[PDB]
């Protein structure tokens with residue numbers, strides 16, 4: 095599924111992401127835009143053999159099982175394929191554990207380089 099901006103904000107807000115660990119809703123929509131272009135089905139292969147999955151490009155090295163990332167962890171206890179669903183529940187619960195782990199939203203390279211220090215509220219501007 096490719097989400098609209100307002101549609102994704104209302105779904106992330108309903109799953110409790112708004113101000114989660116002090117990160118306003120604008121930071122999360124911004125991250126999703128530059129990680130996946132709002133597409134749940136996005137995948138990107140990393141040079142170490144791990145793969146990034148879904149709207150927030152979560153990372154088979156540590157967070158989920160794709161059966162092809164040797165000696166990796168599954169700390170969200172999910173198949174990576176669950177992170178590609180039109181339902182973002184798995185992606186959101188998994189992101190709650192990542193952003194809680196010590197480095198906050200710096201875990202998302204595109205958030206750090208394209209959202210951090212900007213007018214992030216612009217990303218939910220006009221939404222009900």
Ligand SMILES: C[C@@H](O)CN1CCN(CC(=O)O)CCN(CC(=O)O)CCN(CC(=O)O)CC1
Nearest residue numbers: 096097098099100101127131132216217219220
């Ligand atoms: C809401 C309208 O803006 C829709 N829109 C009309 C055309 N826009 C005009 C403009 O945005 O000023 C220019 C192109 N636009 C650049 C950009 O958005 O930054 C990329 C495509 N957009 C992406 C989007 O808007 O989400 C969809 C089409």
Ligand SMILES: C[C@@H](O)CN1CCN(CC(=O)O)CCN(CC(=O)O)CCN(CC(=O)O)CC1
Nearest residue numbers: 099100123124127213214215216217218219220
């Ligand atoms: C040409 C306009 O589209 C100018 N636009 C500024 C104003 N936009 C317009 C809008 O989308 O309504 C509102 C804020 N916008 C939200 C979003 O696009 O998702 C993020 C910033 N954008 C990033 C981008 O377009 O890639 C900068 C370019």
Ligand SMILES: [Cl-]
Nearest residue numbers: 118119120215
């Ligand atoms: Cl915001």
Ligand SMILES: [Cl-]
Nearest residue numbers: 161162163164
């Ligand atoms: Cl594996």
Ligand SMILES: [Cl-]
Nearest residue numbers: 115197198199
């Ligand atoms: Cl933090």
Ligand SMILES: [Gd]
Nearest residue numbers: 099127216217
């Ligand atoms: Gd824009």
Ligand code: NA
Nearest residue numbers: 154158166167
């Ligand atoms: Na794994």
